[PDB]
Ligand binder design. Structure first.
Ligand SMILES: CN1CCN(CCCN2c3ccccc3Sc3ccc(C(F)(F)F)cc32)CC1
Ligand SMILES: CN1CCN(CCCN2c3ccccc3Sc3ccc(C(F)(F)F)cc32)CC1
Ligand SMILES: CN1CCN(CCCN2c3ccccc3Sc3ccc(C(F)(F)F)cc32)CC1
Ligand SMILES: CN1CCN(CCCN2c3ccccc3Sc3ccc(C(F)(F)F)cc32)CC1
Ligand SMILES: [Ca+2]
Ligand SMILES: [Ca+2]
Lengths: 81, 82
């Protein structure tokens, strides 16, 4: 069902998200989003998610068990919420 | 019609948006989001909007024609965004 929504994205939408994804993984080891980068982003947007909530957000879309979110999984994250 | 979705939003949702709105207008001369505050947010999220794109984004939800976005219009900007 979520695979569908992503596919329903236009080049414009995907590129917008890619630009956001890129700035988010700055200074990130594997070039992916971990709880650290996700926390920083949500806090700069005025939110204060707990370490548990951040891990759940990530585990929910971490299909390859990397413990991090790559762009493809990031798109599913966008889709969900 | 986006007036419908705003109604659908839950408090927690509206509360999260308020927290965002509040951080976005820190420093705004009038507590509202002008092109300056919107541009900073867009850029903070890796985007690059022209001054015109920013004006248009504001205009789409500027019901009182203030040239700025207050919290109620912001909710519509969020809902609208889809
Ligand atoms: C308790 N629980 C805590 C988290 N909230 C949802 C936060 C969603 N969110 C958000 C919403 C309003 C204002 C700022 C933000 S930061 C943010 C960043 C990424 C995502 C992302 F990745 F999902 F798209 C979702 C959010 C729901 C309730
Ligand atoms: C179908 N379409 C799916 C995606 N959603 C938008 C998701 C973006 N998003 C979000 C989602 C739910 C609730 C709040 C938020 S605020 C927010 C803040 C940052 C980002 C981030 F990461 F990009 F920076 C993404 C989001 C719109 C409808
Ligand atoms: C020309 N036109 C300009 C705007 N873009 C959409 C921007 C949506 N958006 C967004 C989407 C993905 C990644 C980052 C961002 S920054 C951002 C900041 C605020 C809003 C906010 F306030 F509206 F919710 C919406 C966005 C579409 C095409
Ligand atoms: C369920 N969903 C809840 C709220 N809105 C979505 C807001 C998410 N949002 C957005 C919307 C459409 C396309 C891209 C994006 S990225 C984005 C980036 C920042 C913000 C920022 F900074 F403003 F918070 C909000 C959004 C639509 C319906
Ligand atoms: Ca992963
Ligand atoms: Ca206004």
């Amino acid at each position: 069902i979520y695979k569908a929504a992503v596919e329903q994205l236009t080049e414009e939408q995907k590129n917008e998200f890619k630009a956001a994804f890129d700035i988010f993984v700055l200074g990130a080891e594997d070039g992916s989003i971990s709880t650290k980068e996700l926390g920083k982003v949500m806090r700069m947007l005025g939110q204060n998610p707990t370490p548990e909530e951040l891990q759940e957000m990530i585990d929910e879309v971490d299909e390859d068990g990397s413990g991090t979110v790559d762009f493809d999984e990031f798109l599913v994250m966008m889709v969900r919420s």
